[PDB]
Paper text:
However, because PPi is stable under normal conditions, inorganic pyrophosphatase (PPase) has evolved to specifically hydrolysis the molecule. Here, we solved four crystal structures of a family I type PPase from a strain of the pathogen Acinetobacter baumannii. The crystal structures of AbPPase showed that the enzyme has a typical Rossman fold domain that is highly conserved compared to other PPases. Family I PPases are hexamers formed by two stacks of trimers.
The space group of Structure 3 (K30R) is H32 with eight monomers in the asymmetry unit. In the enzyme assay, K30R lost the ability to hydrolyze PPi. Arg30 in the K30R adopts a different conformation compared to Lys30 in the WT enzyme. The side chain of Arg30 also affects the position of Arg44. Therefore, because of these differences, K30R could not be co-crystallized with PPi and also lost the ability to hydrolyze PPi (see the following section). The structure of K30R showed that the side chain of the Arg residue did not point in the same direction as the lysine residue in the WT enzyme. This suggests that Lys30 also plays a role in PPi binding. In contrast, K30R and K143R lost almost all the activity, demonstrating that Lys30 and Lys143 play key roles in AbPPase hydrolyzing activity. We also found that a highly conserved lysine residue (K30) in the AbPPase catalytic center is phosphorylated during PPi hydrolysis, and mutation of this lysine abolishes catalytic activity, suggesting that phosphorylated K30 is a catalytic intermediate.
Residue numbers in the entry:
A (entry chain E), B (entry chain E), C (entry chain A), D (entry chain E), E (entry chain A), F (entry chain A): 1 to 173
């Protein structure tokens, strides 16, 4: 049970993220059931696109999606599906979808995992093309799913990124 | 425990299949133990062949193999090992092996996973080469395993494919 | 030399396409120099997208924009970069570029290369999602390259594709 | 829980090994937590190196690392992460590290998994370059991790390789 | 040009092989044009099989069937398509085709390319399963291509392989 | 022909590099013949290491050791072997070989190829770990090839890299 994994070692700036879809992976949406812990294939993406970064969730949280809080982690090389990355939140990606709103945070590995992003304090420190690529992926990856839309709102800093994790931690209590 | 996963949402025409070997994967037979849920490597295949499609089993079933009922699912791109696909059975592949008989069903993803096979009602709707390739794989993939043989019998439709799942559901009760 | 290859053994029904970019490949736009026949790295794609079919051109052809005839070849597996596929046109995709009007043909392999695409004689015989991914790919793969933009106009039948081949072979060396 | 898996079927010469890092894999150290069973990313390796073989551990053991006994298995093709290989120990690789000593055994699949190494009785039967490559990997793969060193001591045979498993079996009792 | 390459620095012990199909590659039969030196897509394989060694030919040789000498080069890792391996023959595989009689040599890389195959001087020094996969691959990889069929006759020693090289170099340009 | 390509559109700021070995590729050292322009397999690497950047040379240049100018091109994704990257030098790596003194330039792609490396104007603008992996790779990738050894001397600025380009173009065809 992935519930055994804490939301981190020192939340907010130390979250664990269980990866469901690796970066640059096959065009397949995976989602982890929270009763069997198995990797469920949600949909074979219609668009000819791939995820710009690893995307998963923080364990033992709850937002207004009904499901835990979604995270996108940037790594030097994609991680295996079902893996847990000790990362640090550095931004929040707000956007409106068919069923209300959705909010993704962008994350980055920790001191002991990788020195690559010691200078990444907030999402603006990542390369501009990546941020532009992350926005472009979510706006268009569901363009062939009938009835489903996505519109990108704006970005928010790490301090508010590290805020929504604070509120999702006890919303699961 | 994969036993938490039901055999489906609306059996017969809505089975779940836990994939043990992805399509076009490395020449390695994986099998999921049903006590630890871990992915066990059964044998490194002697033949220079790969699985024509993802092959796994429906959870919480039982046939006359002693183990659950085996399924081959056709997907636009191979799924990760240990994943569960919400698919629909569309055929049955009968064949005789060293220890009696074995029966595989061919399956196909569902409305909400992929529109690719909305027109696939039975195995004859899949391309002929695939069916010919699935038969050729099982007939020859054990040609270098000493003492083991496989002979291909015939094909059966979805209605009888959806029959053996009916009988394997309660044979596990 | 590359232009030591005819446009087709029996054009326009039988044509050759040198492949410049493979399908499902890394997002690297390759274009083949004709002074040198070396593979030139033209663009590292900004958008998180991949080519839905192997992209290339017909040897010994000259289109309007000054270069040979663009062809997307649909194959069972992605072919190597710089390899020659013997194929047959089945449709034509029309668009307007930043430089004016553009057009990409779509083709399936020759009968002797694969039996998978024989009853595919028009582009509408191809899967409906594949046609939509080609439309979606070309409409958005330049979204993050500045100065470029693509507007999808509409498809034309297999007979017009063979006509544009005839006209491209016409004005060339 | 991987604890359900025995240390083998007939220890010593029949150990099970849960693979955490596949061979020739991405430069990523994985480690399996022994409370959640999840695949944890330990560190993104600084060196431009890959693991010469699959490396994991024997379940339900304990050495003087505090963690179970580490094993390197040689296979015809890399196994998926989180898989369990029925292998046979054929050597011991002693070496001193920043925190005391570490000891790895080299292993090899069994009769029923692969005939490739029926003649491999001890690590000297494997190709010399592999042994030289295994030594070179561990000596240098942490050259960019600050504060961490590794020095290679020597090799020991299967009989002593099959000894340390004997002592790690009951050290977990 | 490709035929600007000798059959070997010191034939028949030292030979060159241009590789047409890599090992463990996608099931695409490539053959290299000699008018053009471009890589031609000859066949999308029907059978779910892959080449057990990199397939190619010796430059500046002419066999009976009208084409250069077929050689399978066993390498630690699959080499790129269209690349030149400096290798040494160790055996000969004999068969009868639909067009008559055929023969494929098997070779291991030159000493300066790898120390892994030095004490391999006959094909029986290669692993016994590898010899059987080459026999099984050629006997079945054309099972689904109509009009073709291959019958394995038997192997011949390393000395006959060097003799066929001498005779192939003999009648050529 | 390959030497039908200039050293650069506007050397030394704009240069071309034919890539001989891609990044993160299989440990196969390729070198491009100039008699033939075919890709020659030079060495199957003994050490379990991979190239940290795509390795190649500048056309129409002549260095001291008799061959064109070595350049490592850092790219978002590894480019195909034998492809031409339009790039800009940002630093120089100096070393002493078994044959004397050696030097490898490091380069980032031209502005028109990617916006990711524009504010990279010196090699110290590249990530500090990447600089260390190139130093570590060249210092150890020949550890298991006998007769060879590499000693890292130190880096030099982007202005010296443009100077060595000028001198390499100078004494050449």
């Amino acid at each position: 049970s992935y519930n055994n994994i804490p939301a981190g070692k020192d939340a907010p700036n130390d979250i664990y993220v269980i990866i469901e879809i690796p970066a640059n992976a096959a065009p397949i949406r995976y989602e982890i059931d929270k009763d069997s812990d198995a990797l469920f294939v949600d949909r074979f993406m219609g668009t000819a696109m791939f995820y710009p970064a690893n995307y998963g969730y923080v364990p033992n949280t709850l937002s207004e999606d009904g499901d835990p809080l979604d995270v996108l982690v940037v790594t030097p090389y994609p991680v295996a599906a079902g893996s847990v990355i000790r990362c640090r939140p550095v931004g929040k990606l707000n956007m409106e979808d068919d069923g209300g709103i959705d909010a993704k945070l962008i994350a980055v590995p920790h001191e002991k995992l990788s020195p690559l992003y010691k200078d990444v304090k907030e999402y603006t420190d990542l390369p501009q093309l990546l941020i532009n690529q992350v926005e472009h992926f979510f706006s268009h990856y569901k363009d062939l799913e009938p009835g489903k839309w996505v519109k990108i709102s704006g970005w928010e800093g790490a301090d508010v990124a590290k805020a929504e994790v604070i509120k999702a931690i006890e919303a699961a209590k």
